[PDB]
Amino acid sequence: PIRLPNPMIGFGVPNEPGLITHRSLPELARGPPFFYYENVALTPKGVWETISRHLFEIPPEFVDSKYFCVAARKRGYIHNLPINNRFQIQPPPKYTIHDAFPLSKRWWPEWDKRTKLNCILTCTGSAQLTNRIRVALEPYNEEPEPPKHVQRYVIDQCKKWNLVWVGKNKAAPLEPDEMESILGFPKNHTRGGGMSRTERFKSLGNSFQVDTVAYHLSVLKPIFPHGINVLSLFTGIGGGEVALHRLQIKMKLVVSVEISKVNRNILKDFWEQTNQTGELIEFSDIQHLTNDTIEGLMEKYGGFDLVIGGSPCNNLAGGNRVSRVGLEGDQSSLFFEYCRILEVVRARMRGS
DNA sequence: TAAATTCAGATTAGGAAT
DNA sequence: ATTCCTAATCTGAATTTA
Numbered sequence: 041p042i043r044l045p046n047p048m049i050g051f052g053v054p055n056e057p058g059l060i061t062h063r064s065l066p067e068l069a070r071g072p073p074f075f076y077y078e079n080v081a082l083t084p085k086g087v088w089e090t091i092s093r094h095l096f097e098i099p100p101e102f103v104d105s106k107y108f109c110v111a112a113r114k115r116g117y118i119h120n121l122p123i124n125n126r127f128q129i130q131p132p133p134k135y136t137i138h139d140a141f142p143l144s145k146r147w148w149p150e151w152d153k154r155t156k157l158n159c160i161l162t163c164t165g166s167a168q169l170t171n172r173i174r175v176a177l178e179p180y181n182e183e184p185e186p187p188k189h190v191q192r193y194v195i196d197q198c199k200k201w202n203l204v205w206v207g208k209n210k211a212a213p214l215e216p217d218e219m220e221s222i223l224g225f226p227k228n229h230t231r232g233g234g235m236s237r238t239e240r241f242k243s244l245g246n247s248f249q250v251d252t253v254a255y256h257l258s259v260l261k262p263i264f265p266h267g268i269n270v271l272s273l274f275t276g277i278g279g280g281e282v283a284l285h286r287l288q289i290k291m292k293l294v295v296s297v298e299i300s301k302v303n304r305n306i307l308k309d310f311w312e313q314t315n316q317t318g319e320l321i322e323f324s325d326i327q328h329l330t331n332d333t334i335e336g337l338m339e340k341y342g343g344f345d346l347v348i349g350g351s352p353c354n355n356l357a358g359g360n361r362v363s364r365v366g367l368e369g370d371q372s373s374l375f376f377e378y379c380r381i382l383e384v385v386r387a388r389m390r391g392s
Numbered sequence: 393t394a395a396a397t398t399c400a401g402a403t404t405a406g407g408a409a410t
Numbered sequence: 411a412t413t414c415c416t417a418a419t420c421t422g423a424a425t426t427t428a
C-alpha cells in the first residue's frame with residue numbers, strides 16, 4: 041500500500057531539506073516522450089497503486105503545494121522527467137497569509153493562528169456561512185476575546201471552507217482573482233472568454249498550481265533549446281501551458297484536448313494575448329480522439345516531446361458525496377484514456 | 393435559461409490512549 | 411489489533427435569481 045510521505049515534499053522542494061538529486065526509473069518508463077500525470081493525492085484505498093500499475097510502475101511523487109504558495113494542495117505526480125537541477129519560476133508567490141493578504145491584518149483575530157490556507161476547491165463557502173460566523177461573534181464585541189466554544193466553531197468553519205477575514209467578524213471565501221494569483225496564473229487569466237463567475241470557481245479549483253508544475257517541468261529547458269511539441273490532455277485553463285511559458289520554453293505546437301468550451305476559449309485567449317509564435321490545435325472530447333488521429337498529428341509535426349495532463353478527480357475527491365467511487369467512476373475513468381493516447385505516442389517515439 | 397445560491401457526509405490517515 | 415479523537419478534502423445537485 042502506498043504510504044503518503046510526511047512531509048509531502050516529493051523528491052525535494054525549495055527552501056527545505058531532503059532534496060533527492062537522482063532516482064532510478066524502470067526501463068519500460070523511459071522517454072521519449074517525456075510525460076507528466078497529475079491527480080489528487082488523497083484518493084480512496086488502492087487508487088494510486090492502479091495508476092502506477094498502468095504507468096509503468098513509476099512511484100508517484102506526492103508534493104503539497106503549500107511549499108510553493110500560500111494554499112495547500114496535496115497531489116501525486118507520475119512522470120519520467122529527470123529530477124536533478126530543478127528550479128522555480130521567479131518571483132515565487134507569497135508564502136504566508138500575512139503576505140498573500142496584506143489587508144487581512146486589520147480584521148484577523150489573535151486566536152486565528154493560521155499562516156497557511158487549505159486546498160483551493162471548486163465549491164466555495166456560502167454567504168449564509170459568513171453570516172452564521174458574524175452572528176456567533178456579535179455578542180462578544182465589547183469583550184476582548186470570545187469564549188472557547190465560540191472560537192473553535194469559527195476556527196473549524198474557517199478551515200473547513202478556506203475563509204479569510206475581510207470585515208468586522210466577517211470570514212469570507214477567496215475571490216477568483218485571489219485563486220488565480222495563488223494557483224500561479226496571471227491576473228485575469230480566466231476573466232474573459234464567456235467565463236461566468238460561477239464557472240471561474242469550478243475551472244480554477246480543478247487546475248494546476250503553476251509553480252509546482254513549473255518546478256517539475258523546469259528540467260526540460262536545457263534539454264530542448266528549440267522548443268517542444270506538447271500533447272496536453274485535459275487542458276482546462278492551461279496550467280501546463282502557463283508553466284512552460286513562465287519557464288521560457290518555446291511551444292512549437294500544443295495539441296490540447298479539453299471538453300469545456302469556455303476553457304478552450306481561455307486557452308485560445310491566452311495563446312493570442314501572449315503572442316505565442318507556435319500553433320495551437322484544440323480538440324474537445326478525448327473519447328473521440330482516435331489513435332490514428334494522434335499518429336496523423338505526429339507525422340505532420342514530428343512527434344510530441346511532452347505529454348502532460350491531469351485526469352478528472354470527480355470520483356476521487358473527498359468533497360464528493362455522490363460519486364466518490366474511485367478510478368472506475370464516470371469521469372475519473374478517463375485516466376485510461378490518458379494511458380491510451382500516451383501509449384500511441386510511445387509506439388512512435390520509442391517503439392515496440 | 394445562464395448564472396448564482398445553498399447545503400448535502402464519508403473516506404482516508406495519523407496520533408494516542410487503551 | 412481496537413477505540414477515539416483531530417484533521418484535510420481538484421464535489422453534486424436541487425433550487426432559486428435574475
Ligand SMILES: Nc1ncnc2c1ncn2[C@@H]1O[C@H](CSCC[C@H](N)C(=O)O)[C@@H](O)[C@H]1O
Nearest residue numbers: 246247248274275276277279299325326350
Ligand atoms: N471527456 C473528456 N474529454 C476531454 N476532456 C475532458 C473530458 N472530461 C473532462 N475533461 C476535462 O478534463 C479536465 C480535468 S481538470 C484538469 C485541468 C488542468 N490540469 C488545468 O491546469 O487547468 C477538466 O477541465 C475537464 O474539462
